TrEMBL record, chain A:
This is NADH dehydrogenase [ubiquinone] 1 beta subcomplex subunit 1. Accessory subunit of the mitochondrial membrane respiratory chain NADH dehydrogenase (Complex I) that is believed not to be involved in catalysis. Complex I functions in the transfer of electrons from NADH to the respiratory chain. The immediate electron acceptor for the enzyme is believed to be ubiquinone. Complex I is composed of 45 different subunits. It is found in: Mitochondrion inner membrane. Its main location: mitochondrion.
Automatic annotation (TrEMBL), chain C:
It is found in: Mitochondrion membrane. Core subunit of the mitochondrial membrane respiratory chain NADH dehydrogenase (Complex I) which catalyzes electron transfer from NADH through the respiratory chain, using ubiquinone as an electron acceptor. Essential for the catalytic activity and assembly of complex I. It comes from Sus scrofa. Residues 1-109 form the NADH:ubiquinone oxidoreductase chain 4 N-terminal domain. The chain crosses the membrane at residues 21-41, 61-80, 92-110, 116-133, 145-167, 193-216, 223-244, 256-277, 284-303, 309-330, 351-369, 389-412, 433-449. One of its GO terms (molecular function) is NADH dehydrogenase (ubiquinone) activity. It catalyses: a ubiquinone + NADH + 5 H(+)(in) = a ubiquinol + NAD(+) + 4 H(+)(out). This is NADH-ubiquinone oxidoreductase chain 4.
UniProtKB/TrEMBL annotation, chain D:
It is found in: Mitochondrion inner membrane. This is NADH dehydrogenase [ubiquinone] 1 beta subcomplex subunit 10. Pfam families: NDUFB10. The keyword Electron transport applies. GO terms for cellular component: mitochondrial inner membrane; respiratory chain complex I. The keyword Magnesium does not apply. The lineage of its organism: Eukaryota, Metazoa, Chordata, Craniata, Vertebrata.
From TrEMBL, chain E:
Complex I is composed of 45 different subunits. Interacts with BCAP31. It is found in: Mitochondrion inner membrane. Belongs to the complex I NDUFB11 subunit family. The chain crosses the membrane at residues 37-58. This is NADH dehydrogenase [ubiquinone] 1 beta subcomplex subunit 11, mitochondrial. Accessory subunit of the mitochondrial membrane respiratory chain NADH dehydrogenase (Complex I), that is believed not to be involved in catalysis. Complex I functions in the transfer of electrons from NADH to the respiratory chain. The immediate electron acceptor for the enzyme is believed to be ubiquinone. One of its GO terms (cellular component) is mitochondrial inner membrane. It comes from the Eukaryota. The keyword Electron transport applies. It comes from Sus scrofa (Pig). The keyword Membrane applies. The chain holds residues 53 to 151 of 154 of the full protein. Keywords: Electron transport, Membrane, Mitochondrion, Mitochondrion inner membrane, Respiratory chain, Signal, Transit peptide, Transmembrane, Transmembrane helix, Transport.
Amino acid sequence: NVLQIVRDHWVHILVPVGFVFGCYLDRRSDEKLTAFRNKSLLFKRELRPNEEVTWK
Amino acid sequence: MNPFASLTLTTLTILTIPIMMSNSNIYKTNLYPNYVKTTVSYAFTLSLVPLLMFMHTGQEMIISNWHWMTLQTVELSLSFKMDYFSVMFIPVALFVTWSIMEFSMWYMHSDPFINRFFKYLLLFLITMMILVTANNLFQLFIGWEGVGIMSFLLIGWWHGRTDANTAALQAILYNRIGDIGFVLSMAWFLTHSNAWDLQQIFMLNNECPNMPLIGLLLAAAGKSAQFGLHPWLPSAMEGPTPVSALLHSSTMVVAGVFLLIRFYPLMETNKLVQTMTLCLGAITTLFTALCAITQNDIKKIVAFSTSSQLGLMMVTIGINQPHLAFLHICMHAFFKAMLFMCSGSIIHSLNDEQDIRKMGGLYKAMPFTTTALIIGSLALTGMPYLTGFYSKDLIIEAVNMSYTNAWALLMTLIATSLTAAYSTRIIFFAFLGKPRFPPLVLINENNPLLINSIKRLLIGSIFAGFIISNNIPPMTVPNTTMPLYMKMTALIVTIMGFMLALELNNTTYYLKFKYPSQTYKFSNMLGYYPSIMHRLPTYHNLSMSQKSASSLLDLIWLETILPKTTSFIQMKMSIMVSNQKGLIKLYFLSFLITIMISMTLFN
Amino acid sequence: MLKIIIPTTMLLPMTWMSKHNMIWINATVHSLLISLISLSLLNQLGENSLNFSLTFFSDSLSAPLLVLTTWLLPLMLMASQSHLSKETTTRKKLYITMLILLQLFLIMTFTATELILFYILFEATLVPTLIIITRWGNQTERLNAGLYFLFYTLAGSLPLLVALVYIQNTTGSLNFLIIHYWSHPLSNSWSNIFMWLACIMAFMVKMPLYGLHLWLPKAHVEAPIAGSMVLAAVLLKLGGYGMMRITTILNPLTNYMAYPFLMLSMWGMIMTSSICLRQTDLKSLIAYSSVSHMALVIVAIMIQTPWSFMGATALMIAHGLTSSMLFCLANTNYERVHSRTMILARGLQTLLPLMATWWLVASLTNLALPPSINLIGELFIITASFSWSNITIILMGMNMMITALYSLYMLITTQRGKYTHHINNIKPSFTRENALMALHILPLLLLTLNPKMILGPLY
Amino acid sequence: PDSWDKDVYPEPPRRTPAPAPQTSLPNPVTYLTKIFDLLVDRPVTLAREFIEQQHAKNRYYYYHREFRRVPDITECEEKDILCMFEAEMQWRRDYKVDQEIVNIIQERLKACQQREGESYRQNCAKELEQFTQVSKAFQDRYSDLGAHYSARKCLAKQKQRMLAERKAAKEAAA
Amino acid sequence: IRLQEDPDPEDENLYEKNPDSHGYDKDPIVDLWNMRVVFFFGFSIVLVLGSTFVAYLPDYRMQEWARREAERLVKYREANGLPLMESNCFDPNKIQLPE
Ligand SMILES: CCCCCCCCCCCCCCCCCC(=O)OC[C@H](COP(=O)([O-])OCC(O)COP(=O)([O-])OC[C@@H](COC(=O)CCCCCCCCCCCCCCCCC)OC(=O)CCCCCCCCCCCCCCCCC)OC(=O)CCCCCCCCCCCCCCCCC
Ligand SMILES: CCCCCCCC/C=C/CCCCCCCC(=O)OC[C@H](COP(=O)(O)OCCN)OC(=O)CCCCCCC/C=C/CCCCCCCC
């Protein structure tokens, strides 16, 4: 029945959840390199009234 | 917008269309050959229209429709050069291909893969159109290699025939030497001019040098089967008769001449390359005609005639007459295609017999093919007002009246005489006399397809030269004033060849037997060139490929130097180290020696 | 790069937890999905690389190699499921595990940002390959082949490790960005000569260089089909990638030290083409063709001009795809007749039409046929070598002629002629085999349509 | 057309002679041009009109990115990684712009040769001189930098060139 | 003989049991679904979607940006009589040559 389907096809979510976790870890790695954000001579600009950071 | 670009690109696209429909029920049915032929006819008319547009106002254009890639300062784009040469060669090639396709509908009826045959013919036509209309060297090379591989695939049509496979591979080998020359020229042009297109090449090369021009000359010799690289064209007669008629003789072997024509400014600037071109063309036409006059296979005779005409075109280029070369290209396409079709009809009516020794009586046995072949032979030899007269006569007049090589001039005249000789040989041994074929007479030429195709190619062999010569603008200074004997040199040598060959053929009826001469053996056996040059270099290369490279170096010395010697040394050292008797006396004496050495030598 | 690294490390438990008959389906489907995800790396910048973090970065040279690796994994899965039908479930899962580990190591190798991490990963790629060869090979010579492959690569790579740690002690960092910005000229001294030799010789053995290449025929002939596919398609490209990376710090000494390697590469290109002319084994013929093409790539990297680097990258990608396709075709023939001799089976065009078409297309791409990316790369390399010197054109022309000769000779021998009479077990081609050939060939033509994606950073 | 700038891509004024027929025979080119206009040009014009009507309802705009200038490698200190990075990126952008400049000049040359046709040797001397000058300057700037070119290597080459020019000037004055 | 070894097994043909076999697996249902997923995912998804995605990738290489910049610079320089290609990459005033 349905229980046997999940018992056999619970492995098909492993790669998708791995991809989601990888995207999350990429965001976490990006958020630690925010040392020159809105500080490069080429891309330095004034912040818009309703924004806190130039990029995330 | 001007219809010129639209109509030219439309002809090319509708040529490409039936290849798309090769994955359909129409391709699975038996209507595909007629469908392809109809498409080619429509393309022919739609290409005739821009030819009319050009012959009025001399309109020429280039179309850089699609940009492929920019290698920093070099831009490669899909560009087509619709000039005089392109708009005059596309309709002629389409006309010839239409006739060949109808003839192949009649001729290949029993072939299980006639649909594949027609798809391959259309693919060859597409690649040839790409080659002719190419505006840059890379697209020209695309068309070059495409016609090369399509020739490879169509020559080896019968995959079970080892001779067909050898012919295909030999054609590939010679065309690859030509491609070596082509790549040399491409590399030089890009390196020294930062361009792969004709406009900038011509702008920057005010005095084109020997290296690029010799590269181009080598490529043209390889593709057009000049001397040294000639044997592949006669060997290409292994393919079906439609292949020989359309691909090789008419439209593909003219690729090298066309390449040399497209660079006529640079050829004009240089002189040593012109001399080399003239000499190569002269020796090619002479040698190929000399081999032709004594062959017994009708397809071989026509192939050698094609090679001789190509040599004449190369002579025309070398005397700095590029436009006469193009005119002769068109005229030769017409009458040589018709000659090949006539020989194919003869072969099919006589149950796959290709020997003039077994033909005979066909003058009355087959009326229409007989009159067509006679007209084609008259056009080939330059009958004073047929299609071949408007090009060959002018070529001979220009050769005699120019500052040329004396030996090249003499060889050109002798080649014209031998052209007349071998045309007489074909007529005499094929149509005149008594039958020599097996008694079961299956001679039948009443097929509307065969008759209509030969009719269409027969009108061109009579009138096309007049129309084409009278409609093109004057692109060269005529030789109005010349001595009477020089004006009549072509006719005199043609008539002398006719008479001498006819007499020598009439002597074959006598009840007299004599063994062949050394000159006869040299002429009949193709000058011994295929024997020596196909047994010696190949044997030496294939022998060194195994005795020296694979066996001596790879399997023996590269194994001995690095991996074997190191392994042997390590094995010997391991045996020395581990071969101990396990005696405390021995290795304690060793300990004593080590202690003494460490005490004395280490301070 | 974690969005691509983690799904492979999840391919591992999924393969080990899936049912006994769903392993191939799951592995193939999710490998294809990972390849689709990795296609997003081709969007590169014109100024600098894609700096994901302190550990992984992507460039116009790394991106196509990653896409090729990720696309190559499912094809190896299809071939493996062809030839491993009677294996036990645990051994099938171990085979898939070795393939997955190899792919993960290759991905991290191409995306590593330090030379030392690159070294560690590109040396870690040897273990799965050696296990695959020496465990699932068919014949006896697989053991000797594994020994040759392993010891050639390690004898090449150990001086590279010493040189890398020395360079880090000397300059302070092995990060590729830092060593590109803080590069200094290399003086002509014996010490610099031997540092140059250490690095270059490691990657030349990995290429391989002519005279250092016997392990390549040994390993490629005796490995299973998946091992042969990965060895030729990707593992030969680690040497080229490494040479295109390390030569930043070896100038101007490369101008003087490249003569022996250029002469070896050109003459060995000629020699290996000639060897291909007289080969009695199909796999050996394909292996020596690989040697010739990689010799051309070595020439490009050594002459080291912007036109040569683009040609090197294009030729690397094209050769990977073409050699993989050729190995697959030879393996299908082998599975028919259980022998590798070229003249044993003939008439395969009259017995198997569509396979004859695939053979024709693959052989046409093996020789430089325009406008294929094979020709694009070879032509760029030839042009750069012509600007280098004007007899390189002679050598390149000879090589092109012989390449066409042996490719068409292989096609004519295997396909054309009359069928062998006593071989009556040649069953019709499988949909799996036909799909494998299609998946090899269609991306190559699409790359021909869009050629700027595989021309490297110098474009 | 307003698609491109006529000053960047010049085209000489087009002089088309008026037809002056001398025969009563009909002109097949004229008849076929009329047929082409009736059968092809009108339907394609109608289709393009419909497409452009559909486009005008969803009109949106895109912009051209502007990079402000930054100090170059001459101003950057030795092993100052951030300034070196900014200067190197700026030099690469300038290299790309110079390559496109050379591409524009080459396009001018090709188009002029094709347009002039048979009198190209004399009528395209103006565009040949501009191409010669631009190619000379571009070659002197970026001729032999190598595969691993950089702003530092270009600066070193410029220093070598300046030293050579100074030495030549001193020798001439001596 | 020197061993108790099994005889070499006969080659197993997938077409004998299953005439409409795709060559993936012995089980007909597993074989059919393996074919379906391979064809669908590979051909449809990867080929078509990846090819169109690559075709319509945004111009991050700044090809058109560089062309527009070059057009602007050419227009400005030829309007003012300046050379189209500057003679030096850097400023000789900011470059200090050794004595
Ligand atoms: C190293 C040398 C390099 C030379 C380079 C230059 C080469 C130039 C070539 C010149 C042309 C050679 C023609 C013959 C070659 C083929 C021979 C052969 O086997 O034919 C059989 C072959 C028949 O084949 P088949 O049906 O199988 O029968 C088998 C035979 O029965 C089998 O019987 P067979 O074996 O007895 O038949 C051959 C026999 C019979 O053939 C002939 O007699 C052909 C004669 C052709 C005409 C020659 C005289 C032309 C006179 C022209 C006069 C007017 C000039 C213009 C001015 C007029 C106003 C003043 O020929 C000979 O014995 C020799 C003929 C002349 C050879 C010339 C080359 C010499 C090479 C070196 C010397 C060798 C000497 C020893 C020979 C070997 C040892 C014994 O003949 C033909 O099909 C036709 C033959 C040629 C017809 C055309 C002739 C005219 C065109 C060429 C001459 C030039 C005319 C003027 C041109 C314009 C000038 C401005
Ligand atoms: C640029 C470098 C190359 C320069 C020339 C080198 C030639 C090297 C020869 C190639 C090595 C041969 C390897 C295998 C080739 C294919 C296998 C093979 O030998 O088949 C032989 C095959 C079959 O023999 P058939 O005559 O058809 O008899 C059929 C009987 N049923 O014949 C061939 O293809 C032989 C082709 C070898 C050509 C050798 C000579 C080539 C001429 C080159 C010199 C000419 C220069 C041209 C100057 C042009 C001036 C601008």
